[PDB]
Amino acid sequence: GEITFDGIGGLTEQIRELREVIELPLKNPEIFQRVGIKPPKGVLLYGPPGTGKTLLAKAVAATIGANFIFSPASGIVDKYIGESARII
Amino acid sequence: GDELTRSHFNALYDTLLESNLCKIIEPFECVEISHISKIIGLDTQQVEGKLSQM
Amino acid sequence: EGKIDEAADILCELQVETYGSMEMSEKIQFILEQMELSILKGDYSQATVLSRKILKKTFKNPKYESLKLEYYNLLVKISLHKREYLEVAQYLQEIYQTDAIKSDEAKWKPVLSHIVYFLVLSPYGNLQNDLIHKIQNDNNLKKLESQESLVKLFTTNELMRWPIVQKTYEPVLNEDDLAFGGEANKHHWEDLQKRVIEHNLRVISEYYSRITLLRLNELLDLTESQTETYISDLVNQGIIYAKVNRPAKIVNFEKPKNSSQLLNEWSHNVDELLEHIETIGHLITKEEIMHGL
């Protein structure tokens, strides 16, 4: 990302929750397996965008090194046979 | 002491009896009906009639 | 204190919870305590499953002979209670390989004797074929030679052989010293007795084509009733098939026929004949050139 999580501190509770849900399954699957529960697979962000929401999403990608892959929703509709299916 | 079980044990005792008769003969016949009769635990007559049915 | 049940239970939760595979040295010790507790309890199964999982893991990892031997020492005590001789032979066969490289031959040559000896106890062995071939199975020790010759006794057998052989040789043939350590000398005799009798009939079906009943019992040195019982058990197992004349004292070694069975035999002689002609062709070609000279 373009920002870190010290660059946007004062969203704390939301920082702490996102940390534990996305970073942590990569670092140890192992704890979730021994218990036998599946690992977390999804995260949802809602709120108005670019108040802190967009900021969180970038900030998380940075620390993990994770590759951010942005999809524009109106790139996933194009007007030919089977293109919409292929992109997702 | 319950009738339901007692009826199935009756039925099973017959089927087992024929199943034993077939098991004994299974190394093959040219064998004496006196010998089978002793081995199974039974009298001559009962054996002859069950061996025919089989 | 004597709280066998309580110790076994606390162990069961622990080993799974601590470790998937991260540290073996510590995991193996906990597993060892469980195995000990499991024999006494009568709960045969929990140990057997644990021994199998840990063994695979250690083999894949850096190898250590010691660890393995400890799994085995516990296993056989459970195996005696059940009685699968095949099971002990296999488990010992894979540790024989670890012994081969690591350990000196003084341990090794008794282990070899022990695996073939479990396979004597049980009826047949697929496994035995592999072992008999080895060149360290027919030299060296007394115990190795005795063992190779007993598996040979079953092949030639007339069953007057056995008590003279049994009595003369027991260095390892009611005994062990690096596997069970003995089971019970009288109890091993039982397993030996059923196998020799069984094997004398297996070889006789192939060699003979008629035998009288009086003659068969004479070889087994048992009563007609007893020979009759062994014949029954064997036809049932379906390793050999025979027909019985109880009052006329013949044992036939016949089993079903169809003409098509002998058709295959006709067409095998044809087949030996065609193949002969291909050899014949090439042979003529060689022979001529020599004639000329």
Rounded CA separation C88/C77 (Å): 10
Token pair for residue C40? Answer: 């006494």
How big is chain B, counted in residues? 54
Nearest to A18 by CA among A59, A66, A76: A59
B-facing residues of C in 248-267 (CB < 8 A) are 248
Distance CA A38, CA A19 (A): 18
HSE-CB for C167 with a 13 A CA cutoff: 5
The rounded distance, in Å, linking the Cα atoms of C276 and C293 is 26
Q: Which residue is it, tokens 């087992």?
A: B16
Closest CA to A18 of A76, A66, A84: A66
Nearest CA-CA partner of C231 in C219, C247, C242, C223: C242
Under 8 Å between Cβ of B28 and C241: no
Label residue C258 exposed, middle or buried (CB < 10 Å: 0-12, 13-18, 19+). Answer: exposed
Best probe of the C interface among A30, A34, A35, by most C CBs < 10 A, is A34
In the numeric block, which tokens belong to residue A47?
A: 């709120």
Tally of CB atoms within 10 A around A2: 11
Best mutation target among B21, B25, B28, B38 (most C Cβ atoms within 10 Å) is B28
A36 CB within 8 Å of a chain C CB = no
Resolution in A: 7.7
Rounded CA-CA distance B20/B7 in Å is 20
Chain interruptions in chain C, by residue before each (C–N > 2.5 Å): none
Q: What are phi and psi of C159, to 5 degrees?
A: 55, 45
Nearest by CB to residue C247, choosing from B27, B28, B32, is B32
Q: Are C46 and C62 in contact (CB under 8 A)?
A: no
Specify whether the backbone of C196 is left (phi greater than 0), alpha (psi in -120 to 50) or beta.
alpha
**Which chain C residues contact residue A33 at CB under 8 A?**
20
Q: How many Cβ contacts (< 8 angstroms) between chains A and C?
A: 5
CA distance A61 to A43: 13
Which strand (E) or helix (H) includes residue C251? strand C250-252
Q: Which residue of A has its CA nearest to C19?
A: A34
Q: How far apart are CA A16 and CA A12, in angstroms?
A: 6
Identify which of C244, C247, C248 has the shortest CB distance to residue B28: C244
Q: Which two tokens stand for residue B37?
A: 């009769």
A87: helix, strand or coil:
helix
Alpha helices in A21-77 (DSSP H): 24-27, 30-35, 53-64
- HSE, side-chain direction, 13 A CA sphere, residue A36: 2
Q: How far is C246 from chain B (nearest CA, A)?
A: 5
Q: Where are the domains of chain C?
A: 1-207, 208-256
* CA–CA min distance C32, chain A (Å): 21
Residue whose tokens read 């002491």: B1
Convert C191-220 to b/e letters by CB count within 10 Å (16 or more is b): bbeebbbbbbbbebbeeeeebebeebbebb
Nearest chain C alpha carbon to B22:
C236
In whole angstroms, what is the distance from residue C35 CA to residue C108 CA? 25
Q: Is the distance from CB of C193 to CB of C203 less than 8 angstroms?
A: no
| Contact present, C88 and C79 (Cβ < 8 Å) | yes
Annotated binding site of A: 47-54
Q: Coil, helix or strand for C60?
A: helix
